[PDB]
Write a structure and sequence with these properties.
The structure is a homodimer. With about 70 residues, chain A is mainly α. The first copy, chain A, has one domain (about 1-65). Helices cover about 65% and strands about 0% of the residues of chain A. Chain A has 5 helices and no strands. Chain A has helices spanning about 5-15, 20-25, 30-35, 45-55, 60-65. At the A-B interface, helix 4 and helix 5 of A face helix 4 and helix 5 of B. Chain B: It comes from Vibrio cholerae serotype O1 (strain ATCC 39315 / El Tor Inaba N16961). Chain B: GO terms for molecular function: DNA binding. Chain B: Antitoxin component of a type II toxin-antitoxin (TA) system that counteracts the effect of the HigB-2 toxin. Binds to its own promoter and regulates transcription of the higB-2/higA-2 operon. Chain B: This is Antitoxin HigA-2.
């Protein structure tokens, strides 16, 4: 439903990943993610869903990679 | 770049024996938007496509999503 810029950064920090690496694993551009992390735009509802999914279920990154 | 065809979107939903409205709500979109994706009038945004292919290959994902 909702996720703040600080929370988006924190998800990435669980994985000890740089922005570019995390973005790539989410099939999202680095710059789009930067905009979200920096509070310049809001992610769409499916992106929020995706970030929240990865947060709680880290194995989702691997699933994505194998798509 | 990931892609999912309109027919594939319909098949995923039917596989979940789910109405268009419920599936849409779980994906955080409207039934009207999902209908556009299913009929090929629109293509989902990139994160939407990713979610769809996940739910397609990993069914348990829908359960995870429901509980976020």
């Amino acid at each position: 439903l909702n996720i703040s810029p600080d929370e988006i950064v924190s998800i990435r920090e669980q994985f000890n990943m740089s922005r570019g690496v995390f973005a790539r694993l989410l099939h999202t551009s680095s710059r789009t993610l930067e905009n979200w992390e920096q509070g310049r735009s809001v992610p769409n509802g499916q992106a929020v869903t995706l970030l929240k999914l990865v947060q709680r279920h880290p194995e989702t990154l691997s699933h994505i990679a194998e798509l």
